[PDB]
Motif scaffolding. Structure first.
Motif, PDB file in Angstrom:
ATOM      1  N   UNK A  54       0.833  -1.191   0.000  1.00 56.18           N
ATOM      2  CA  UNK A  54       0.000   0.000   0.000  1.00 56.18           C
ATOM      3  C   UNK A  54       0.867   1.240   0.000  1.00 56.18           C
ATOM      4  N   UNK A  55       0.194   2.377  -0.071  1.00 56.80           N
ATOM      5  CA  UNK A  55       0.838   3.679  -0.036  1.00 56.80           C
ATOM      6  C   UNK A  55       0.541   4.451   1.242  1.00 56.80           C
ATOM      7  N   UNK A  56      -0.093   3.821   2.237  1.00 57.59           N
ATOM      8  CA  UNK A  56      -0.145   4.429   3.560  1.00 57.59           C
ATOM      9  C   UNK A  56       1.193   4.345   4.266  1.00 57.59           C
ATOM     10  N   UNK A  57       2.107   3.498   3.790  1.00 57.29           N
ATOM     11  CA  UNK A  57       3.363   3.248   4.484  1.00 57.29           C
ATOM     12  C   UNK A  57       4.581   3.184   3.587  1.00 57.29           C
ATOM     13  N   UNK A  82      -7.979   2.599  -1.822  1.00 57.63           N
ATOM     14  CA  UNK A  82      -8.143   2.980  -3.202  1.00 57.63           C
ATOM     15  C   UNK A  82      -7.188   4.087  -3.594  1.00 57.63           C
ATOM     16  N   UNK A  83      -7.654   4.940  -4.505  1.00 56.99           N
ATOM     17  CA  UNK A  83      -6.842   6.044  -4.987  1.00 56.99           C
ATOM     18  C   UNK A  83      -6.428   6.934  -3.833  1.00 56.99           C
ATOM     19  N   UNK A  84      -5.224   7.479  -3.920  1.00 63.08           N
ATOM     20  CA  UNK A  84      -4.734   8.332  -2.855  1.00 63.08           C
ATOM     21  C   UNK A  84      -3.533   9.108  -3.355  1.00 63.08           C
ATOM     22  N   UNK A  85      -3.134  10.079  -2.549  1.00 63.90           N
ATOM     23  CA  UNK A  85      -2.119  11.050  -2.902  1.00 63.90           C
ATOM     24  C   UNK A  85      -1.322  11.399  -1.662  1.00 63.90           C
TER      25      UNK A  85
END
Lengths: 242, 134, 238, 244, 246, 234, 250, 249, 135
Positions: free
Chosen positions: G106-109, G144-147
Motif C-alpha cells: 500500500x501507499x499508507x506506508x 483505493x486512490x490516494x495522494x
C-alpha cells in the motif's frame, strides 16, 4: 563527537577541567536532600518542589530508590541521568550476589558508582553525569551504619551527615551545630525531629513536599506516612512558643 | 540624564523627592530598558493594557460612532464577532471609512453593509506551508 | 562552514562549492566535440604541447574502457582516471554478473549516482570533472551521454565542451535546424570526421597536423584512435 | 575534522551550568501545535489542536497529532513527525516483545523509562541532537489501574493529572487550575477540553477539521478498555451539543 | 587563497577551482635537491646531486635511490621519506601483480597504480599530499619509457626530465642537447652528457661541494635491469664533464 | 610579531612548504641535552651526560639496549625512545628466529624512517619528537647513523646533538683523520671522544656519575660502562 | 578515514527552527514547478523540464518515474538527489513488504519508509538532506486512490490537489476555484494542464511536457496473459500526441 | 607572536611553537593544587606521610585514603586528584600478581613503574604501537616505595609526563618547594626510621594550614620483616607526643 | 570628561594627610565599566550588598508594620520563602499594596489574603524560568 575530547579533555591553566566544576555548579539548582546515621538507624530525606496540586502524588518518581532490602540511594539535580545509575548499580547487586554467592557490601558499591563517572569524564564522545548522589544502608548481618557521598568528579567520601543540592550551605551549618561525632541520637524518632527541623528554613511548612524513609538492622526498610510526618511537623512547631 | 533623574528622586531630595509630585510614564517594550527603573524604587505598578475583549470592542465601536447620523437598522456588535483581538484603537478606523464608502457614493445615510466591507479592508490585504511540526 | 564544505547549503537555497567544480574543468583551455552516424561516431580533442620532452604517444585524454564503449575527459587528468578506472572495473562486474556488456545509459545512470553520494557524505570531495561517453548500442543506435560533478546526465544529438561550448555549438545547431535531422548522414567512419573538423575550423580557423589532434570512433564491437592524415581531404574544397 | 566541524556545542555545559540544545529544543516545540490529556475516574481522553487547515488539504483520512502503541495504550504527540515514527517503531515492538517472553502486557511505568532512555542516550553520547519531541501517554493496568504520564526531549518523564503541551500552555493550566475536581466522570471532562481549547487559539470558529481527540473507557465489566479515536461525524456531535 | 581563505585545508576548491594546499608542495620540492631522468634509445638513466651538508659523510654509503622489483628504477626529490614511503608501496603491489598474472610488471599500468595512491591522498580532508616530484623509467618488450611524477598525479611520459632548484637551468640543456641528436643516444655516452648537467646545475650553491650517484639500465648492457655504475666508467665521466666545462 | 596559523595540525603545508609543527618537535632536542658518538673501522661508541632535579635525585637514563649487535642513545623526549626501542627490539629479534642472518644496521633506519612518515601525514596521532643516535656492527663492519623525526637517517663517522654541541662536532671536524685510523684501541678514541664533550659546559667537579658510555666492536658485545668504572675514562 | 561523524544540522538555533532544513527547501521553491491532483476514479501528476539547450535530448531525462506498477511519482526541486533514492525506494517495496509477504505495498506506508530514508540523513554525521520535496500517487483496496506529499524533513501530508515549486502558490491560489469535488479525469487533466501553462513561457509544445496517471488496469500491457489473478498495471504514462490532442481543444 | 599558548593549547597532541607540548604541563601543575605528600629513603625501612584535608568535622577522616598498598611489600601514596588514580592502582597491582604467576617470584619495583609510567602515554601516541584508549592525561604525582633484593629500600616519583626519578626524598603539593629545601639540608645518609618519622612531622607542623593532630596526617612504614602497613591514630598520637621536648628549646 | 576624571583622580590621591576625610561612592554595576584606577594608593577596598537571606528577610517587615495596624495576626513567617528571590524592596510595596487592597475597601482592615493577592500579583510581572530539565 565520536571521540574528539571536546573540552572535557582540555585542562585549564589553573589546573581544573571546565565541564566538571560546571556540572556540580549546575546541580545546586535541584531539590535538596539529606542523610543521617545515628546509634542504630540511618535516615534520609528530600523534598518535592511545589506543584499546582497536579504533580501526580501516587506514582511520583521519588528520590529514595531501593537497591535491595538493605541499601538505598538519594540524589540531586538532574533526573534522566539518575535513572541509569540506579539501574547499572542494582544490576551489579543481583550479579554480585550470584557469582560470589553472597550479597554486596557498601564499600564495594560506592567504589563502583564513583568509579563509573570517571570513565564518563575520561573518555571520548561522552558528557559527564551532571549529578551528585549518596548511598545509605548497612552491610549484611552488621549493626554498623554507613553512608557515602559521591559526586561527578568521581570521588567518594564517607560522612555522618551531609546535604546536596540547593541551599545546603544554608542547612549543613545547622547540623554540625546539633549533630556531633560525640554522641548519636538515641533511636529513630530522635534523628527525625532533628532531621526534619533542619530543613524548615527552606520549607515554607510544606509537609507534603518532604518525604522520608529510614533504615534499620536486618534490612527493615520503610517509608513513612504523611500523617506520621505531619504530626512531627506540628509538635515541633508547638515548641516554637518563645 | 537617566543616571541623574534616577538619583534626582533619591538620597539628596529623596526625603522629599517623590513626596508630592506623583509622576507617571507611558511606553512600549518594557523588557529592553534598565531594570533599575521599573523597581519599587521610583515605580509601583507595572500595569498592562492588553487588547480588548469582544464585549469591550462593542463599547469602543459605539462611542466614536456618536456623531455620525440619524442611522437605523444596525446591530453594531456582530462586527466585533467578525473581528478578533486587533485593538480598541483601530476600530475607529473601520468606523471611519464606513462613512467614506457611503460618502464615496453620496448617501449620507449608512448601513451595516459598509461595516462588513471596511472591516475586511484592513487586514485581508495585510496578510508558507512548512508545518514540519506536527 | 556554508562556503567551504558541501553538505551544508547556503542560507539562500543553494550552495557554492560544487559550482566551482564545474569551473576547474576549464583549467586546461581544451575543446572537444562529438557526433553521430548510422553506424559511426567521432570524437576529437585538440592537443597542446609545451616543452618538447614529452612522449606524445603517452599524452592522452582518452580511455577506451571497453569494447562497445568509449570516453574522453575534460578538466585535469589525475582526478579523471579514478573516474575512468572504477568504470573499467565495473564492466568486469555487469558482464560477469548480468551476462553481457554495459550499455552507456546504465553506466551514466551509475557513474553519476555515486558522484551524488560524493556530495552527501563529504569525506570525498567531488571529482573535478565533467565527462562524456560514446558507443554503438544495439537497440537505440549510436548514443552519446554527458556526465558531470553532480549528475544531470543527458543523451545528446551531439555535444560541445571546453571554454568555448557556446559558439562551436552555434556553428553546429545552425544547420540541425536547417537539415531537419538529429541524425547525420555519410555513415562511413571517414566522411563524418571531416564534418567534425571542417565545422570547428570554420569556428576557429587554425591549421593542424597529425601531431596536434586525434580521433575516436564508436563502431560495432569496436572503438579506437587512429592516424589523422585525412586532414588533407578538406583541401580539395577551396 | 575537529577544528572546523563544530561537534563540540553538543553534549556540553554552560559555564553557568546548564545546557543549550535542550533548553532550545524544549522551546522549539512551542512553535508547534497543541494537545492535552487528563485523567477521569471513569476513563481517559486526549485532544489536539492542529494549525494546518488549508481547505483542500485532506484532514479526514487519518491523523498526525495522535498515534497508538498497542491495544491498551495511546499517546498525544508533539514535535516534528520525522522524529516520531522511529521510537514509535521502537515502542510498538516493545509490547510485542514484552508479551512475547512474559505473555502479559506492559506495566506502563516501564516503557517510558525505555523511551526516555534513548532520548537521554543522545544528549550524553555522540554529538547528535535529541529528538525534538514531547509526548503524552494514556494507559491502564492492574497494579496501578489508570495512569497518565508526560515526557520531554531530554528524557525526564513525569506522572501528571491534567496537562497541556506545545503552545500557549502556561495559561491553559491556569485556565483550568480551578476547574479540575477529582471525581471527574468522562462526560464532564470533554466539556473542559473545548472550554480549554476554545479560549486559547487563533479563531474561535474552530472548524472540526482543526481538531482531533480520543477516549478510553471500561465498557465490558471485568474487561479491557476501549481504545476509540473519534472520527469526524462523531467528533462533530459533541462539538455542537455544547451549542457553539 | 590569502587569509580568511581556503588554502589551509585540503579538498576545498578555491573559487578558481584549485587546492592551494597542494601548490604549496611543489615549492617544497622546488626547495630540494636536483635530479633528472633521460631516455636512451634503448633504455634509461638517472642521476642526482647527493648533498654534502658536512664533512663526516661517507661516499657510497647513504644513497638517494631505491628500486622496483627487478627493473623499474625510481628516484626521489624534495622530501626523501615521503618518497621512501610509496616506494615501499612500489615493491609491494608489483608483487601482487607478479604472483597473480605470472609475469613482471609493465610500466604504464604501474603508474595506473602509483598515479592513484597519491591522488587518493589529495581528496580527503584528514591527510597530506606527498611533497615530492618522483621519476621512474624502465624497460619492457614494448621498449622503454620514462615517467615523471607530480603530487596531484599529473604524470606524463617524457624523454628528458628534471626537478629541484636547477630546473630551467638544467632542462634547457636537455632541450639544447636533444635537437642536436634526433638519433637518440645509446647508454654509456648519455651518462657523461648528463653529468655535465649537475656540475653545471650546482652553480647556484657554490658555498659548498657535493657529489652524485648514477643509475644504469639498458638492453645491451644489463639485459634491461637496474643498477649503478662504478670503476673507471663514471670516473672517466666526472673528470670529462668537469674537463669540458672550463 | 604576530601569530601564524598552519601550525594547528601536522597535516598542513606552510605557504612555503614547511611542516611548521615538525620543526617545533626538532626544537625540543636542541632544547634538550646531548648524546654523541663516533666510529672506528672496528669499534664505535655512544656517550652522553646526565641531568637531575636536585642532589637527592638520581640521573636520567639515556642509553638503551636493543640487541648485542646494536644499541642506541637518545636526546629529547623519553617516551618516544621506548616506543621505538620496544619496537626496535622486535625486528632485530624477529630476524633472529626467521632468517637468523642477523639484522644489519642500515635497513633498520630504512624502516623506522618510514615509521615517522606514517605518523606525520595522518590526523589522530603525533610526531615522535626525538633525534637519537645509534650504532651497530655487521659483515659490513661497524657503522654509525643519526635520526631525525623527519625520517632523514644518515650514515656517518661521528656527530653531536643537543645544546652547546657545536664546538664538539666542530672539534670533531677539526680532528677527523686521526681517531678513526686506529683499530683495537677503543680506550683512546674515547679519550678524544670525551674532551670532545669538554667543549661547552660547566662541570666544575668529578663528573663521575654525570656520564655514561657503551661500546661495541668486532668482538665487544654491547655493554654500558657506567659507574666509577667510567671514572678512569675521564 | 572520514573522521567527520560530527553531526551536521543537529544544532538547533535558539529560536528552535533548524538550520539546513529551512535552507534546503529554500532550493525547492527556487526549483521548477510541478503539481499533482486527485479525483474519484483516477489520479494525475505532471511538470515540465526546461531542457535549457536545444540539442540535448528531452525524452531520456524522465522526470516522472515509476516505482511500482500501481504507484508513480514526480518532484520539482533538485534532480540528481531524486533518482538515487527511488532506487532505494523501489528496492524497499521488494524487500520490506513483497519478499516477506508477496504483494506490492500500500501507499499508507511506502511513503513512511521513504521518509525514513530522509530523516536518517538529516540526523547522522556530515550528511546533507536531499534537496527534493516530491509527491506520490497510488491505489489500494482498503483506501483505493490516494495522494501524498513529502518534504526533506520527513513530514508527509496527504493532499487533494497541490503544486510545489516556483509558482505553486499562484497555482494553489488557482486550482481551488475552478477545482471541483468530483472533477473526473478528462477535465482534470485539462485544468491540470492549463494549471501549468500559466506558469511558463518559452514554448508549450506537446513534447515539452510529461505527465501520467493512476486509473484502471490495462492488461494489454501486462504481457503475461493467461492468469485471471494478474490484474493490469494501473499506472501508465502517456505519449506526446495523445497529450497534444487534448491540447488542440485549447 | 602575541599568543603562543592560547592559539595552540586546544590542540591536545600539538607541540608548542617553542617545543614543550602543552596539555602535559597543564597536567603537571594540578598536583600542587591538591594536597602534599612526602617520603624518605632509609635502609632499615621507609616512611611515607601526607595530610588529608579535614574539611568539615563530619567527615570521618579515617575514611579518606591518600595512601594504599600495592602488594605486601609495596605501598603508594597520592596527591592532586584521586578519581583518576584508582585506574592505575587497579592496573598496577595487577602486574605484581601476574609477575608472581608467570614468573612465580616476587616482582621488582623498577620493573613496576615502567609499566605504570608508560600507561599514561596512551593519549596521542601509544606505548607498544597500539593506537589509543583514553582522551586526556590525568594528573596524580605518586610515591611508590618498596623493598627488593637487588637494591633494597627504594622509592620513585611518578609523573603523568612519563618521567620518574629515584629521589631519596621528595614532596608534593604547593608546599613542596617550601619544604623540599628544608629536607635537602637535613637528609643524612645513615639515619634511622624513627628520627625520620620524627623529622617528617616537623614539616607538617611547619607547612600546614592548620594545627595538626591524629586527624590531620597519617603515616605508613616499610620493613623487610613485615612488608608494608600503616600507623593507627594513637600511635600517631605518641610520636607527636614525645616530639615536643626535642623542641623545648 | 576625561579631564573631569583626571583632576579628581588627582585631587583624591594628590591629597595626602587624610586625617579626617572619607571620600566614598557607590553604584549598581562596575564589573564592565570602571577603570583600572584601583590602587590602595588611591582606593583601598570595596564592599558588597546583594539579596538577603530568609532570616535576613525576617528582620524586615513586621518592624515596618510595627507602625501599622495588623487588625489580625496572620503568621507572616510562613508567608515568604527563600525560593522566591524577591527584591529587598518589593515588600514595603507589599506592606502598602494590601492597605491599597483596603484602599480597595471601605474597611481599613488587615488581612493575610491581601498579601496573598499581592505577591501573586507583583510576581506576575517578575520573571520566571523554565524547569525544563528539572535541574
Amino acid at each position: 563527537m565520536s571521540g574528539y575530547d571536546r573540552a572535557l579533555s582540555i585542562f585549564s591553566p589553573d589546573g581544573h577541567i571546565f565541564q566538571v566544576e560546571y556540572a556540580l555548579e549546575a546541580v545546586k539548582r535541584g531539590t535538596c536532600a539529606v542523610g543521617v546515621k545515628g546509634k542504630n538507624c540511618v535516615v534520609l530525606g528530600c523534598e518535592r518542589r511545589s506543584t499546582l496540586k497536579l504533580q501526580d502524588t501516587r506514582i511520583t518518581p521519588s528520590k529514595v530508590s531501593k537497591i535491595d532490602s538493605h541499601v538505598v540511594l538519594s540524589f540531586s539535580g538532574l533526573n534522566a541521568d539518575s535513572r541509569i545509575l540506579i539501574e547499572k548499580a542494582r544490576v551489579e547487586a543481583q550479579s554480585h550476589r550470584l557469582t560470589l554467592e553472597d550479597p554486596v557490601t557498601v564499600e564495594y558499591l560506592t567504589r563502583y558508582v564513583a568509579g563509573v563517572q570517571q570513565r564518563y569524564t575520561q573518555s571520548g564522545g561522552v558528557r559527564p553525569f551532571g549529578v551528585s548522589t549518596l548511598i545509605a544502608g548497612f552491610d549484611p548481618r552488621d549493626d554498623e551504619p554507613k553512608l557515602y557521598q559521591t559526586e561527578p568528579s568521581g570521588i567518594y567520601s564517607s560522612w555522618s551527615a551531609q546535604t546536596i543540592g540547593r541551599n545546603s550551605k544554608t542547612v549543613r551549618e545547622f547540623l554540625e551545630k546539633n549533630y556531633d561525632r560525640k554522641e548519636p541520637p538515641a533511636t529513630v524518632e530522635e534523628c527525625v525531629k532533628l532531621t526534619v527541623r533542619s530543613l524548615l528554613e527552606v520549607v515554607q511548612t510544606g509537609a507534603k513536599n518532604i518525604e522520608i524513609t529510614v533504615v534499620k538492622p536486618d534490612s527493615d526498610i520503610v517509608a513513612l506516612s504523611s500523617e506520621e510526618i505531619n504530626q512531627y511537623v506540628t509538635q515541633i512547631e508547638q515548641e516554637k512558643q518563645e | 540624564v537617566q543616571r541623574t533623574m534616577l538619583e534626582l528622586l533619591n538620597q539628596l531630595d529623596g526625603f522629599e523627592t517623590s513626596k508630592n509630585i506623583k509622576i507617571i510614564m507611558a511606553t512600549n517594550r518594557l523588557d529592553i530598558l534598565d531594570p533599575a527603573l521599573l523597581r519599587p524604587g521610583r515605580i509601583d505598578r507595572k500595569i498592562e493594557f492588553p487588547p480588548p475583549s469582544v464585549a469591550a470592542r462593542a463599547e469602543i465601536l459605539r462611542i466614536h460612532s456618536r456623531k455620525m447620523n440619524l442611522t437605523r437598522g444596525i446591530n453594531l456588535r456582530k462586527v466585533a464577532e467578525k473581528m478578533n483581538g486587533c485593538s480598541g484603537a483601530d476600530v475607529k478606523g473601520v468606523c471611519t471609512e464606513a462613512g467614506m464608502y457611503a460618502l464615496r457614493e453620496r448617501r449620507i445615510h449608512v448601513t451595516q453593509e459598509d461595516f462588513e466591507l471596511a472591516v475586511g479592508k484592513v487586514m485581508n490585504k495585510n496578510q508558507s506551508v512548512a508545518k514540519l511540526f506536527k | 562552514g556554508y562556503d567551504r564544505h558541501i553538505t551544508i547549503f547556503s542560507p539562500e537555497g543553494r550552495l557554492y562549492q560544487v559550482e566551482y567544480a564545474f569551473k576547474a574543468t576549464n583549467q586546461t583551455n581544451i575543446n572537444s566535440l562529438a557526433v553521430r552516424g548510422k553506424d559511426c561516431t567521432v570524437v576529437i580533442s585538440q592537443k597542446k604541447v609545451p616543452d618538447k620532452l614529452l612522449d606524445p604517444t603517452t599524452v592522452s585524454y582518452i580511455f577506451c574502457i571497453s569494447r562497445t564503449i568509449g570516453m574522453v575527459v575534460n578538466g585535469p587528468i589525475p582526478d579523471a582516471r579514478n573516474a575512468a578506472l572504477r568504470a573499467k572495473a565495473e564492466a568486469a562486474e555487469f558482464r560477469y554478473k548480468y551476462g553481457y556488456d554495459m550499455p552507456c545509459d546504465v553506466l551514466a545512470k551509475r557513474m553519476a549516482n555515486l558522484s551524488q553520494i560524493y556530495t552527501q557524505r563529504a569525506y570525498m570531495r567531488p571529482l573535478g570533472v565533467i565527462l562524456t561517453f560514446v558507443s554503438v548500442d544495439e537497440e537505440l543506435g549510436p548514443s552519446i551521454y554527458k556526465t558531470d560533478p553532480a549528475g544531470y546526465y543527458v543523451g545528446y544529438k551531439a555535444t560541445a565542451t571546453g571554454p568555448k561550448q557556446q559558439e562551436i555549438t552555434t556553428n553546429l545547431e545552425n544547420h540541425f535546424k536547417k537539415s531537419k535531422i538529429d541524425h547525420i548522414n555519410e555513415e562511413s567512419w571517414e566522411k563524418v570526421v571531416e564534418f567534425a573538423i571542417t565545422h570547428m575550423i570554420d569556428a576557429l580557423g587554425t591549421e593542424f597536423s597529425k601531431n596536434d589532434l586525434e580521433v575516436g570512433v564508436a563502431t560495432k564491437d569496436k572503438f579506437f584512435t587512429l592516424s589523422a592524415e585525412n586532414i588533407e581531404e578538406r583541401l580539395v574544397a577551396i | 575534522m575537529g577544528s572546523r566541524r563544530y561537534d563540540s556545542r553538543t553534549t556540553i555545559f554552560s559555564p553557568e551550568g546548564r545546557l543549550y540544545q535542550v533548553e532550545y529544543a524544549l522551546e522549539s516545540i512551542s512553535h508547534a501545535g497543541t494537545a492535552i490529556g487528563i485523567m477521569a475516574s471513569d476513563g481517559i481522553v486526549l485532544a489536539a489542536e492542529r494549525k494546518v487547515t488549508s481547505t483542500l488539504l485532506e484532514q479526514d483520512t487519518s491523523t498526525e497529532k495522535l498515534y497508538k502503541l498497542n491495544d491498551k495504550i495511546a499517546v498525544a504527540v508533539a514535535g516534528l513527525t520525522a522524529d516520531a515514527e522511529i521510537l514509535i517503531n521502537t515502542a510498538r515492538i516493545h509490547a510485542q516483545n514484552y508479551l512475547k517472553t512474559y505473555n502479559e502486557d506492559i506495566p506502563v511505568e516501564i516503557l517510558v523509562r525505555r523511551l526516555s532512555d534513548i532520548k537521554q542516550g543522545y544528549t550524553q553520547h555522540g554529538g547528535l541532537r535529541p529528538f525534538g519531541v514531547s509526548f503524552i501517554y494514556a494507559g491502564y493496568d492492574d497494579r496501578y489501574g489508570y495512569q497518565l504520564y508526560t515526557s520531554n526531549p531530554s528524557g525526564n518523564y513525569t506522572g501528571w493529572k491534567a496537562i497541556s503541551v506545545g503552545a500557549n500552555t502556561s495559561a491553559a493550566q491556569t485556565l483550568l487550575q480551578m476547574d479540575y475536581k477529582d471525581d471527574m466522570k468522562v462526560d464532564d471532562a470533554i466539556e473542559l477540553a473545548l472550554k480549554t481549547l476554545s479560549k486559547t487559539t487563533d479563531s474561535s470558529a474552530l472548524t472540526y477539521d482543526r481538531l482531533e481527540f480520543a477516549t478510553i473507557r471500561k465498557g465490558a465489566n471485568d474487561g479491557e478498555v476501549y481504545q476509540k479515536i473519534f472520527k469526524p461525524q462523531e467528533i462533530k456531535d459533541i462539538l455542537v451539543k455544547t451549542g457553539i | 587563497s590569502i587569509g580568511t581563505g581556503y588554502d589551509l585545508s585540503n579538498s576545498v576548491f578555491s573559487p578558481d577551482g584549485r587546492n592551494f594546499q597542494v601548490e604549496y608542495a611543489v615549492k617544497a620540492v622546488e626547495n630540494g635537491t636536483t635530479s633528472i631522468g633521460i631516455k636512451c634509445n634503448d633504455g634509461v638513466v638517472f642521476a642526482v646531486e647527493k648533498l654534502i651538508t658536512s664533512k663526516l659523510l661517507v661516499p657510497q654509503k647513504n644513497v638517494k635511490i631505491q628500486v622496483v622489483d627487478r627493473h623499474i628504477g625510481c628516484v626521489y626529490s624534495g622530501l626523501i621519506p615521503d618518497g621512501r614511503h610509496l616506494v615501499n608501496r612500489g615493491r609491494e603491489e608489483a608483487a601482487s601483480f607478479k604472483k597473480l598474472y605470472k609475469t613482471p610488471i609493465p610500466i604504464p599500468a604501474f603508474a595506473d597504480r602509483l598515479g592513484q595512491y597519491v591522488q587518493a591522498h589529495t581528496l580527503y580532508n584528514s591527510v597530506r599530499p606527498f611533497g615530492v616530484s618522483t621519476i621512474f623509467g624502465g624497460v619492457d618488450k614494448n621498449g622503454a619509457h620514462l615517467y615523471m611524477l607530480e603530487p596531484s598525479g599529473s604524470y606524463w611520459g617524457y624523454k628528458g626530465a628534471a626537478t629541484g632548484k636547477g630546473r630551467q637551468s638544467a632542462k634547457a640543456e636537455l632541450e639544447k642537447l636533444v635537437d642536436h641528436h634526433p638519433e637518440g643516444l645509446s647508454a654509456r655516452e648519455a651518462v657523461k652528457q648528463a653529468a655535465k648537467i649537475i656540475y653545471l646545475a650546482h652553480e647556484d650553491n657554490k658555498e659548498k661541494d657535493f657529489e652524485l650517484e648514477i643509475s644504469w639500465c639498458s638492453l645491451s648492457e644489463t639485459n634491461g635491469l637496474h643498477k649503478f655504475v662504478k670503476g673507471d666508467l663514471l670516473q672517466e665521466a666526472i673528470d670529462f664533464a668537469q674537463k669540458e666545462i672550463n | 610579531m604576530f601569530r601564524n596559523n598552519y601550525d594547528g595540525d601536522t597535516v598542513t603545508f606552510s605557504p612555503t612548504g614547511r611542516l611548521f609543527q615538525v620543526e617545533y618537535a626538532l626544537e625540543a632536542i636542541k632544547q634538550g641535552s646531548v648524546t654523541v658518538g663516533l666510529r672506528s673501522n672496528t669499534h664505535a661508541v655512544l656517550v652522553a651526560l646526565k641531568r637531575n632535579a636536585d642532589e637527592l635525585s638520581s640521573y636520567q637514563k639515556k642509553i638503551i639496549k636493543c640487541d648485542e649487535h646494536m644499541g642506541l642513545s637518545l636526546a629529547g623526549l623519553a617516551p618516544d625512545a621506548r616506543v621505538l626501542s620496544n619496537y626496535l627490539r622486535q625486528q632485530c629479534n624477529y630476524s633472529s628466529l626467521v632468517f637468523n642472518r642477523k639484522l644489519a644496521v642500515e635497513r633498520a633506519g630504512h624502516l623506522l624512517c618510514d615509521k615517522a612518515q606514517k605518523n606525520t601525514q595522518s590526523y589522530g596521532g603525533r610526531p615522535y619528537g626525538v633525534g637519537l643516535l645509534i650504532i651497530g656492527y655487521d659483515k659490513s663492519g661497524a657503522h654509525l647513523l643519526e635520526f631525525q623525526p623527519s625520517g632523514n637517517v644518515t650514515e656517518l663517522y661521528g656527530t653531536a646533538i643537543g645544546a652547546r654541541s657545536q664546538g664538539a662536532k666542530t672539534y670533531l671536524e677539526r680532528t677527523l683523520d686521526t681517531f678513526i685510523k686506529i683499530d683495537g684501541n677503543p680506550d683512546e678514541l674515547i679519550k678524544a671522544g670525551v674532551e670532545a664533550i669538554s667543549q661547552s659546559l660547566r662541570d666544575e667537579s668529578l663528573t663521575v656519575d654525570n656520564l655514561s658510555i657503551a661500546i661495541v666492536g668486532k668482538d665487544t658485545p654491547f655493554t654500558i660502562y657506567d659507574g666509577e668504572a667510567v671514572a678512569k675514562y675521564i | 578515514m572520514t573522521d567527520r561523524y560530527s553531526f551536521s544540522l543537529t544544532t538547533f538555533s535558539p529560536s528552535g527552527k533548524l538550520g539546513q532544513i529551512d535552507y534546503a527547501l529554500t532550493a525547492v521553491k527556487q526549483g521548477v514547478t510541478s503539481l499533482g491532483i486527485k479525483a474519484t476514479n483516477g489520479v494525475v501528476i505532471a511538470t515540465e523540464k526546461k531542457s535549457s539547450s536545444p540539442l540535448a535530448m528531452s525524452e531520456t531525462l524522465s522526470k516522472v518515474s515509476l516505482l511500482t506498477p500501481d504507484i508513480g511519482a514526480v518532484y520539482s526541486g533538485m534532480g540528481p538527489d531524486y533518482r538515487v533514492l527511488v532506487d532505494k525506494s523501489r528496492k524497499v517495496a521488494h524487500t520490506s513488504y513483497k519478499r516477506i509477504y508477496g504483494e506490492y505495498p500500500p501507499t499508507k506506508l511506502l511513503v513512511s519508509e521513504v521518509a525514513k530514508i530522509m530523516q536518517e540523513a538529516t540526523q547522522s554525521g556530515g550528511v546533507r538532506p536531499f534537496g527534493v520535496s516530491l509527491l506520490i500517487a497510488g491505489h489500494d483496496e482498503f483506501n483505493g486512490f490516494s495522494l501524498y506529499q513529502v518534504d526533506p524533513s520527513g513530514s508527509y501530508f496527504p493532499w487533494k490537489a497541490t503544486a510545489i515549486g516556483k509558482g505553486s502558490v499562484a497555482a494553489k491560489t488557482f486550482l481551488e476555484k475552478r477545482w471541483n469535488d468530483e472533477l473526473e479525469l478528462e477535465d482534470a487533466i485539462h485544468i491540470a494542464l492549463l494549471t501549468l501553462k500559466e506558469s511558463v513561457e518559452g514554448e508549450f509544445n506537446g513534447d515539452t511536457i510529461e505527465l501520467a496517471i493512476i486509473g484502471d488496469e490495462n492488461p494489454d500491457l501486462l504481457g503475461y496473459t493467461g492468469i485471471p489473478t494478474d490484474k493490469g498495471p494501473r499506472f501508465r504514462k502517456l505519449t506526446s500526441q495523445e497529450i497534444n490532442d487534448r491540447l488542440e481543444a485549447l | 607572536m602575541f599568543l603562543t599558548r592560547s592559539e595552540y593549547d586546544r590542540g591536545v597532541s600539538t607541540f608548542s611553537p617553542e617545543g614543550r607540548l602543552f596539555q602535559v604541563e597543564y597536567s603537571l601543575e594540578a598536583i600542587k593544587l591538591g594536597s602534599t605528600a612526602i617520603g624518605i629513603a632509609t635502609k632499615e625501612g621507609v616512611v611515607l606521610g601526607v595530610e588529608k584535608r579535614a574539611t568539615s568535622p563530619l567527615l570521618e577522616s579515617d575514611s579518606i585514603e591518600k595512601i594504599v598498598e600495592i602488594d605486601r611489600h609495596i605501598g603508594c601514596a597520592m596527591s592532586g586528584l584521586t578519581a583518576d588514580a584508582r585506574s592505575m592502582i587497579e592496573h598496577a597491582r595487577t602486574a605484581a600478581v601476574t609477575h608472581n604467576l608467570y614468573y612465580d617470584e616476587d616482582i621488582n619495583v623498577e620493573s613496576l613503574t615502567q609499566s605504570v609510567c608508560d600507561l599514561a602515554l596512551r593519549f596521542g601516541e601509544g606505548a607498544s604501537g597500539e593506537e589509543r584508549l583514553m582522551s586526556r592525561p590525568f594528573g596524580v604525582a605518586l610515591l611508590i616505595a618498596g623493598h627488593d633484593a637487588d637494591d633494597g629500600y627504594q622509592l620513585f616519583h611518578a609523573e603523568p609526563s612519563g618521567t620518574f626519578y629515584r629521589y631519596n626524598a621528595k614532596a608534593i603539593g604547593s608546599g613542596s618547594e617550601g619544604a623540599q629545601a628544608e629536607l635537602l639540608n637535613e637528609w643524612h645518609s645513615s639515619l634511622t626510621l624513627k628520627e625520620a618519622e620524627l623529622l617528617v612531622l616537623k614539616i607538617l607542623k611547619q607547612v600546614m594550614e592548620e594545627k595538626l593532630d591524629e586527624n590531620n596526617a597519617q603515616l605508613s612504614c616499610i620493613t623487610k620483616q613485615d612488608g608494608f602497613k600503616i600507623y593507627d591514630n594513637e600511635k600517631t598520637a605518641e610520636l607527636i607526643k614525645e616530639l615536643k621536648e626535642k623542641e623545648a628549646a | 570628561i576625561q579631564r573631569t576624571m583626571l583632576e579628581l583622580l588627582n585631587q583624591l590621591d594628590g591629597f595626602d594627610d587624610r586625617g579626617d576625610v572619607k571620600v566614598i561612592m557607590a553604584t549598581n554595576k562596575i564589573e564592565t565599566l570602571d577603570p583600572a584606577l584601583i590602587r590602595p594608593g588611591r582606593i583601598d577596598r570595596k564592599i558588597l550588598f546583594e539579596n538577603p537571606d530568609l532570616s535576613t528577610k525576617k528582620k524586615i517587615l513586621g518592624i515596618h508594620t510595627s507602625k501599622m495596624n495588623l487588625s489580625e495576626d496572620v503568621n507572616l513567617e510562613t508567608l515568604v520563602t527563600t525560593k522566591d528571590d524577591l527584591s529587598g524592596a518589593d515588600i514595603q510595596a507589599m506592606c502598602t499594596e494590601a492597605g491599597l487592597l483596603a484602599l480597595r475597601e471601605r474597611r481599613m482592615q488587615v488581612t493575610a489574603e491581601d498579601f496573598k493577592q499581592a505577591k501573586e500579583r507583583v510576581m506576575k510581572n517578575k520573571v520566571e524560568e523554565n524547569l525544563e530539565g528539572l535541574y
